[PDB]
């Protein structure tokens, strides 16, 4: 058993890199729900946030940050399924990916394209979620396509990733038993530090406004390059607080910061134990 002990103790060794993620108040882990247009997503984000925060969040939009643990909180957002551009951006900044697969239709090129863009830009954790398990009377073909999807998913992610199986939708959203142990899978994931993310200060924007002057818009007449506040949590390395820091807002251009006022946490984690339903918050 000594040769077994050597050959198993060997595969604990990895490249020693820095972490750059704090341990006191880490940011909410970015969970991106990625699917081709017509499967899961909305229904799935609604079901997960309803199980997590006891709040029916009908008509979602934007990033949604909830508290799902005693110290793990996480941000839910959904890619628009037709845009390769938004697909690329959330591939570059996501931490967990819920990969929606229409199990009746099979694999699809939108999820294959996301898998390759993520694989080249620093592959995050990926939990595959196969829906539309209403194949036919044939539970035989249900099991066959189940195994084939698991194996094809295992060739794209590491051999032993989690493919999850959702049954039919019942009353607007998914079965809460399945969403309960799906959240049990999300709650233990043990994230490992990436490279671009952990030498770069980035931020997903959950709130947006223009703090321009409307009578200045009445003066000049809507052609104005107008100033904008962008609120959100920031990840990665510490973004410096001096004005003039250059920043790429991924999809509108390059800017430099003007002023930063950090705000108190709108969705904080509270200080064996369990998570109080009072403290299961939502922002």
């Amino acid at each position: 058993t000594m040769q077994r002990s050597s050959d198993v103790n060997e595969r604990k060794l990895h490249v020693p890199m820095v972490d750059r993620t704090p341990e006191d108040d880490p940011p909410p882990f970015i969970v991106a729900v990625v699917g081709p247009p017509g499967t899961g997503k909305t229904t799935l984000i609604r079901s997960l946030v309803r199980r997590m925060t006891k709040s029916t969040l009908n008509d979602i939009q934007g990033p949604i940050t909830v508290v799902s643990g005693k110290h793990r909180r996480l941000t839910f957002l959904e890619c628009p399924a037709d845009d390769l551009n938004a697909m690329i951006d959330i591939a570059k900044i996501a931490d967990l990916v819920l990969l929606l697969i229409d199990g009746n239709f099979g694999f699809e090129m939108e999820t294959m394209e996301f898998l390759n863009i993520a694989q080249h830009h620093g592959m995050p954790r990926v939990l595959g979620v196969a829906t539309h398990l209403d194949l036919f009377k044939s539970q035989s073909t249900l099991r066959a396509s189940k195994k084939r999807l698991k194996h094809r998913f295992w060739t794209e992610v590491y051999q032993g990733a989690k493919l999850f199986y959702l049954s039919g939708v019942i009353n607007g959203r998914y079965p809460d038993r399945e969403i309960l142990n799906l959240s049990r899978f999300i709650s233990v994931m043990k994230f490992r530090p990436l490279k671009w993310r952990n030498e770069h200060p980035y931020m997903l924007a959950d709130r947006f406004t223009d703090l321009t002057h409307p009578e200045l818009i009445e003066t000049q007449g809507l052609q104005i390059d107008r100033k904008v506040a962008i609120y959100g949590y920031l990840h990665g390395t510490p973004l410096p607080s001096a004005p003039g820091t250059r920043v790429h807002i991924a999809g509108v251009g390059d800017f430099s910061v003007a002023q930063i006022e950090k705000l108190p946490d709108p969705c904080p984690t509270p200080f064996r134990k369990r998570l109080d339903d009072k403290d299961k918050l939502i922002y």
């Binding site: 000594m2 040769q3 050597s6 050959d7 060997e10 595969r11 060794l13 990895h14 490249v15």
Partner: peptide
């Protein structure tokens, strides 16, 4: 490599 058959390394 010592007692193992393979070894992990850094390029």
């Amino acid at each position: 490599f010592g007692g193992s058959s393979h070894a992990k390394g850094i390029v």
